[PDB]
């Protein structure tokens, strides 16, 4: 049971070191914050007539 657990924690290191897709639930929050701010700065360019 200890060897299965130690091996399973060993796969978490490798998975997180390897796959680009994993933390997508966090990076899409950082990206929505950044995109909303860049859109709000970009709306300073608009003439509104």
């Amino acid at each position: 049971i200890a060897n299965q657990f130690n091996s399973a924690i060993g796969k978490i290191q490798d998975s997180l070191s390897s796959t680009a897709s994993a933390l997508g639930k966090l990076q899409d929050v950082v990206n929505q914050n950044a995109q909303a701010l860049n859109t709000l700065v970009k709306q300073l360019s608009s003439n509104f007539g």
Partner: protein
């Protein structure tokens, strides 16, 4: 330079602190602009810096 100043260059009135830039403008360009469509570099008409 390095003080806050009510600048005007060529009718570009604004407020800010001026500083010596390292941007490589071409001879045809008088102003550089921000993402916000606001000027953030200028070539002085008295001296080409």
């Amino acid at each position: 330079k390095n003080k806050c100043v009510n600048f005007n260059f060529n009718g570009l009135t604004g407020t800010g602190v001026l500083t010596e830039s390292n941007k490589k403008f071409l001879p045809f360009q008088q102003f550089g602009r921000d993402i916000a469509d606001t000027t953030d570099a200028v070539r002085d008409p008295q001296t080409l810096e």
